[PDB]
Design a protein around this ligand. Sequence first.
Ligand SMILES: *[Se]c1ccccc1C(=O)Nc1ccccc1
Ligand SMILES: CCCCCCCCCCCCCC(=O)O
Ligand SMILES: CCCCCCCCCCCCCC(=O)O
Ligand SMILES: CCCCCCCCCCCCCC(=O)O
Ligand SMILES: CCCCCCCCCCCCCC(=O)O
Ligand SMILES: CCCCCCCCCCCCCC(=O)O
Ligand SMILES: CCCCCCCCCCCCCC(=O)O
Ligand SMILES: CCCCCCCCCCCCCC(=O)O
Ligand SMILES: CCCCCCCCCCCCCC(=O)O
Ligand SMILES: CCCCCCCCCCCCCC(=O)O
Ligand SMILES: CCCCCCCCCCCCCC(=O)O
Length: 582
Amino acid sequence: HKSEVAHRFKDLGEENFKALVLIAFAQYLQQCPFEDHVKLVNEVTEFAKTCVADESAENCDKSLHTLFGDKLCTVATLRETYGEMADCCAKQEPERNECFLQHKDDNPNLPRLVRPEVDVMCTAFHDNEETFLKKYLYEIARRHPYFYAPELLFFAKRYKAAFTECCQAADKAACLLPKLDELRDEGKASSAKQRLKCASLQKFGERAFKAWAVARLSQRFPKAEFAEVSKLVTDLTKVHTECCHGDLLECADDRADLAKYICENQDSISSKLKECCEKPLLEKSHCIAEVENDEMPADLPSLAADFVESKDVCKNYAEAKDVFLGMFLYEYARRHPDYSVVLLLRLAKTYETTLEKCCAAADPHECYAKVFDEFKPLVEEPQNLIKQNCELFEQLGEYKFQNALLVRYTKKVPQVSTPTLVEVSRNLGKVGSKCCKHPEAKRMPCAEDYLSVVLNQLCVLHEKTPVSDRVTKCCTESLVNRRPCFSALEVDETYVPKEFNAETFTFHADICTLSEKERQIKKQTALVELVKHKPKATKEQLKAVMDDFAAFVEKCCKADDKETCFAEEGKKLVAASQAALG
Ligand SMILES: *[Se]c1ccccc1C(=O)Nc1ccccc1
Ligand SMILES: CCCCCCCCCCCCCC(=O)O
Ligand SMILES: CCCCCCCCCCCCCC(=O)O
Ligand SMILES: CCCCCCCCCCCCCC(=O)O
Ligand SMILES: CCCCCCCCCCCCCC(=O)O
Ligand SMILES: CCCCCCCCCCCCCC(=O)O
Ligand SMILES: CCCCCCCCCCCCCC(=O)O
Ligand SMILES: CCCCCCCCCCCCCC(=O)O
Ligand SMILES: CCCCCCCCCCCCCC(=O)O
Ligand SMILES: CCCCCCCCCCCCCC(=O)O
Ligand SMILES: CCCCCCCCCCCCCC(=O)O
């Protein structure tokens, strides 16, 4: 368009425009005060208004990248604060923008953002809604400079909704704290998903991502023909490559182009997209990404005729191997939305291995006649794992299920630090509580998503400080066999048991007035240390000791003299447990 800033303003509107400008400048100028960013936002919005009133007004015909870079380069403290980032201003576009993009800081060193009390948060929201929400948007944007800005805005809208609902409630905290925890978990998971997809693309190549996209899109749009699914795969791979490069405008343009193509070809893709396709360009691609799978066509035949029984199986495969394998993955995935994507990828890899082996064999047709038999144990392994773990969850409840997982995973990898073990086992228990309440048809996708986020968290922590070769192997594996690698871990037979430390099992009266969450964390930390000290202890011995611990805590937390109760009863409990275990 003649004026890109005016067109963007008119499509997005003033509120969204200002929010996104604030996000972008905070993602680049991560160290500048909130008031300075607000001043910059007001200036940019004012210029955009001049452009909207008259497309021929001065500087309105310049590109968005040129305008953004110039505004960045007018910041007076650029050298003093950012150093070599100021040197980007001596380059011409697009070198200047590429330099600015390269000089973003993934891990800025700012203090952690502390959650204020519910009442002060609600009071600040009530006094000035706009400044409260904008300041927190600035704080989050300056800490996650690669996070997709429109998704940040979509999170911010729900934050406003949560505050609006819960700050007029009878019990403000009990309303708002679950919503804040939900949103924080959700945002951290989304950022991890972005980084994870980009790193997997870089490490394992475009072809693996295209296989993943074939599976996911065939699940999403089972009535679509394979040619349309392949078109969507190519375009989505392009979009994700460019978004992994990190240029916000180029990434947003690619996403918008894909969204409007999908909206104009709804008749060939899905029957569930009308509402998303009536939505603004800002929300369209996100809406499309979040919509549930379409209904699969009825009475789909088995893959046997085309992929096992055909006499031309090897000819069709060797003609164009990846198209044939994509067709196999398409037909398999469209029939099985109940599968994780990685399970379907395992099936595709198995079929590819069998075809490579058999089409060079003396009798290929006889060779691959039973390839579908190989799919049965691969399919049933995660189904059986889900069955077992959800049975144990319904028997135990979330906390005692977390304790079971705690014992199991400490026995498997005792070298891992206790905080990591506790945090990851708690999150795995949360995965259990989340996914075990779905019907089976949806249980495996849920597990895949939430396990992927939890396992990624673990892998990132363990890479910051490596301690176990098996964890490193699982964490560097292909994401298709990352979870199977983790499920295949066994009890560490070579572990030398940790020696007794009296302080570790010394307890005080503060435990009685800790929050329930913190008290649970302390009890679980002590349980991990106990399993590290006595790894051979049977479940009956451990359960007897835990019952003794619960009795001791209940008695001394209601004792008139808590301190000496804890000391004396703790010496008694420690000696009694030590005599029971062995
Ligand atoms: Se940028 C920055 C970083 C740390 C402390 C202060 C600043 C700042 O004031 N930047 C600024 C000055 C003038 C106009 C806009 C922004
Ligand atoms: C739930 C997050 C815990 C850490 C941050 C504590 C304060 C949360 C307030 C969030 C206000 C909205 C932020 C936004 O606009 O994105
Ligand atoms: C990579 C996550 C580091 C921890 C981030 C602390 C602040 C999170 C605020 C919660 C809501 C926004 C989450 C997000 O921006 O991704
Ligand atoms: C001569 C080619 C025969 C190949 C076997 C399929 C014949 C029917 C084609 C239409 C159904 C499958 C199309 C598709 O792969 O999406
Ligand atoms: C200097 C002016 C900068 C303002 C331009 C910001 C444009 C952001 C567009 C985001 C649109 C996202 C569309 C999508 O993801 O599908
Ligand atoms: C959020 C990743 C997709 C970015 C582009 C949005 C366009 C959606 C096309 C359909 C792809 C669905 C991906 C998904 O499973 O979320
Ligand atoms: C139409 C595009 C086809 C893309 C290639 C599909 C091949 C399926 C077999 C490979 C499956 C494993 C993928 C992976 O390495 O993670
Ligand atoms: C033999 C190592 C294969 C790695 C892939 C593991 C796939 C997980 C499903 C497990 C089903 C049993 C077959 C198998 O172990 O592969
Ligand atoms: C501790 C988690 C409780 C939920 C049960 C998970 C059982 C293993 C997950 C199976 C599905 C994962 C996705 C996949 O690997 O295909
Ligand atoms: C803290 C290290 C634990 C790493 C191993 C956790 C296993 C996660 C795999 C999925 C969980 C259910 C499947 C299983 O129990 O085998
Ligand atoms: C339902 C609440 C039950 C809480 C159980 C927590 C288990 C913690 C184990 C602590 C073991 C103490 C024995 C010892 O120090 O030797």
